[PDB]
């Protein structure tokens, strides 16, 4: 009898051309295909603003007729190589922020979703702890960098014969939102 038929394609971020003429022939028989467009900021699988949707035995094809098009913005606090490039939905791009800045929080890539970039392509200043605020007697900070990013650890080594609170001859402390995890102890 009938391996039938397909209903009106509710095209997200797009629409069918000649909408008034084609409505109501629906439900539409299999094999029938219609030209459709995609709204601004969106594209067809072929990469154009218009294509053809086909009534398949398993529904409309393509299943996602209109994919988002993402525009890589300028990065004031990062290294720029893609400012102005366009990417189709599902694409992941590497993001290089300047030392001390990171993506939120903290991916190394932004992916183009249907709703736009995920996360937003912008480098935010990372919170830090200063080595100058550290205090240790009978040991020293064996690193030795001045600024530590959140969750980064500051290494310290005790003096000959002294031990930490583990009690080992060396340990570390962690940088947090509230400052250092604690004070190094070498006794």
Ligand X SMILES: O=S(=O)(O)OC[C@H]1O[C@@](COS(=O)(=O)O)(O[C@H]2O[C@H](COS(=O)(=O)O)[C@@H](OS(=O)(=O)O)[C@H](OS(=O)(=O)O)[C@H]2OS(=O)(=O)O)[C@@H](OS(=O)(=O)O)[C@@H]1OS(=O)(=O)O
The nearest distance, CB 30 to ligand X, in angstroms, is 39
Contacts of 178 by beta carbon, 8 Å cutoff, 6+ apart:
none
CA dihedral sign of residues 83, 86, 88, 89: positive
The nearest distance, CB 100 to ligand X, in angstroms, is 21
Find which of Cl ion, ligand X, none residue 148 binds, CB within 5 to 8 Å per kind.
none
The nearest distance, CB 133 to ligand X, in angstroms, is 36
The nearest distance, CB 165 to Cl ion, in angstroms, is 16
- CB nearer to Cl ion: give 76 or 168: 76
Contacts of 52 by beta carbon, 8 Å cutoff, 6+ apart:
33, 34, 35, 36
Cα–Cα distance measured from residue 36 to residue 68, given in angstroms and rounded to the nearest whole number: 15
Judge whether 135 and 150 are in contact, CB under 8 Å.
Answer: no
Look at residue 10 and give its three-state secondary structure: coil
- CB nearer to ligand X: give 85 or 151: 85
- CB nearer to Cl ion: give 114 or 143: 143
Find which of Cl ion, ligand X, none residue 73 binds, CB within 5 to 8 Å per kind.
ligand X
Find which of Cl ion, ligand X, none residue 17 binds, CB within 5 to 8 Å per kind.
none
The residue ranges that bind ligand X (CB under 6 A) are 71-74, 83-84
The residue ranges that bind Cl ion (CB under 5 A) are 75-78, 122-123, 136, 140
- CB nearer to ligand X: give 83 or 151: 83
CA torsion angle 104 110 112 115 (round to 10): 0
């Amino acid at each position: 009898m009938g391996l039938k038929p397909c209903d009106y394609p509710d095209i997200k971020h797009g629409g069918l051309y000649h909408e008034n003429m084609r409505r109501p022939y629906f439900p539409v028989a299999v094999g029938k295909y219609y030209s459709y467009y995609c709204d601004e900021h969106f594209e067809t699988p072929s990469g154009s603003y218009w294509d053809h949707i086909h009534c398949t035995q398993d529904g409309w094809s393509p299943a996602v007729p209109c994919l988002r098009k993402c525009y890589f913005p300028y990065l004031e606090n990062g290294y720029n190589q893609n400012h102005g490039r366009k990417f189709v939905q599902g694409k992941s791009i590497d993001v290089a922020c300047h030392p001390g800045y990171a993506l939120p929080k903290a991916q190394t890539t932004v992916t183009c979703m249907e709703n736009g970039w995920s996360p937003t392509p912008r480098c935010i200043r990372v919170k830090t702890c200063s080595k100058s605020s550290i205090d240790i007697e009978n040991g020293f900070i064996s690193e030795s960098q001045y600024t530590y990013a959140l969750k980064e650890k500051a290494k310290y080594q005790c003096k000959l014969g002294y031990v930490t609170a583990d009690g080992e001859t060396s340990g570390s402390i962690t940088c947090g939102k509230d400052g250092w995890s604690a004070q190094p102890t070498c006794i």
